[PDB]
């Protein structure tokens, strides 16, 4: 613990909306300090989204204006992508960082495969 709940794969409709669920059970004494979503590009994951103390940041150009991350429910940081393109198909990683009762930080991440259905 803590453990992210992320489906092994998700299929979305071409040009529609898709949700990549990423949730966890909030632990007492654990303070969420960072959320990242990454897309896999060969051997390296590339950050597409960051939520830190200044709010939300969409990084990689391919994702501007159509990427939203849930924020209303604690422990739900699911990624919503709108107007799904064929080339959005890839493995995506949800990554959450916490501060712990022992002053340390803990990171967890989990991978999902996004498939696009014509």
């Amino acid at each position: 613990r803590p453990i992210l709940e992320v489906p092994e794969s998700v299929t979305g409709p071409w040009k529609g909306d898709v949700n990549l669920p990423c949730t966890y059970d909030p632990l007492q004494g654990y303070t969420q300090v960072l959320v990242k979503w990454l897309v896999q590009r060969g051997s390296d994951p590339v950050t597409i989204f960051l939520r830190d103390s200044s709010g939300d940041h969409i990084q990689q150009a391919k994702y501007q204006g159509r990427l939203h991350v849930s924020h209303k429910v604690p422990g739900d940081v699911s990624l919503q992508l709108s107007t799904l393109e064929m080339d959005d198909r890839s493995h995506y990683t949800c990554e959450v960082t916490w501060q712990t009762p022992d002053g340390n930080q803990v990171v967890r991440d989990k991978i999902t495969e996004l498939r696009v259905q014509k």
Partner: nanobody, 121 residues
Framework: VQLVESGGGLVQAGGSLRLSCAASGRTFSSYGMGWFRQAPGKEREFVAAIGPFGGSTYYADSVKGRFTISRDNAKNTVYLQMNSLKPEDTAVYYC??????????????????WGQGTQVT
């Protein structure tokens, strides 16, 4: 669907084993793989892990330098090359698979599939 280890046995101290875990069911190239060990009457401890995609490797302090982990994606197999075997390495060794990427590879709750284990003495 199934993970099957192999390669365990009695080995003279300072020797070498090559442990192997054969995975069946998915493209495990997208799964992080780990090795865990549990000595008799002692708790399950992390030994080694290798992440999905790129071959990023991680080791427990105890086995660092002596142990190495590798993966043959085409064969769906992960190997644990055990060299310079101190006697404290006597334990059952288990392979495990999870969908972590670069973090959480020592947390046993982070692994969805487990092997039966293989004894090393």
């Amino acid at each position: 669907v199934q993970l099957v280890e192999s390669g365990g046995g009695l080995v003279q101290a300072g020797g070498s084993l090559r442990l192997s875990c054969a995975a069946s069911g998915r493209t495990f190239s997208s799964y992080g793989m780990g090795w865990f060990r549990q000595a008799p009457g002692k708790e399950r401890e992390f030994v080694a892990a290798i992440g999905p995609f790129g071959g990023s490797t991680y080791y427990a302090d105890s086995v660092k330098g002596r142990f190495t982990i590798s993966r043959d994606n085409a064969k769906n197999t992960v190997y644990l090359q055990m060299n310079s075997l101190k006697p404290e390495d006597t334990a059952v060794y288990y392979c495990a698979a999870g969908r972590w990427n670069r973090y959480g590879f020592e947390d046993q709750d982070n692994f969805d599939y487990w092997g039966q284990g293989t004894q090393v003495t």
